[PDB]
């Protein structure tokens, strides 16, 4: 139900392009889903402890500002994604 209309900033947009998403405006749900696919396809999660993402050597690490994080860190994830987009004035 995360329907917030958003326009990713250049870094986030580059990440989205990696999984085939080239539009400029998204729902938050879409951004979140595509970032999950990004992590999957770049194989940035630990194969033995899959909630751990190791992003130091990936562009994702520039977004999050840390070398690693857990998918359990929901507030941090949301926070870092929102700071990398602009919420659209006209919602809906």
């Amino acid at each position: 139900e995360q329907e917030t209309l958003v326009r990713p900033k250049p870094l986030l947009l580059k990440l989205l392009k990696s999984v085939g998403a080239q539009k400029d405006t998204y729902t938050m749900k879409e951004v979140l889903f595509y970032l999950g696919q990004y992590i999957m396809t770049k194989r940035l999660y630990d194969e033995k402890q899959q909630h751990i993402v190791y992003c130091s050597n990936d562009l994702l690490g520039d977004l999050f500002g840390v070398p690693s994080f857990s998918v359990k860190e929901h507030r941090k994830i949301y926070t870092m994604i929102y700071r990398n987009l602009v919420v659209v004035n006209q919602q809906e």
């Binding site: 999950g36 999660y45 909630h51």
Partner: peptide, 10 residues
């Protein structure tokens, strides 16, 4: 096997 928020990616 990668779980993320509302979704599962293997």
């Amino acid at each position: 096997p990668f779980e993320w928020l509302d979704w599962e990616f293997x």
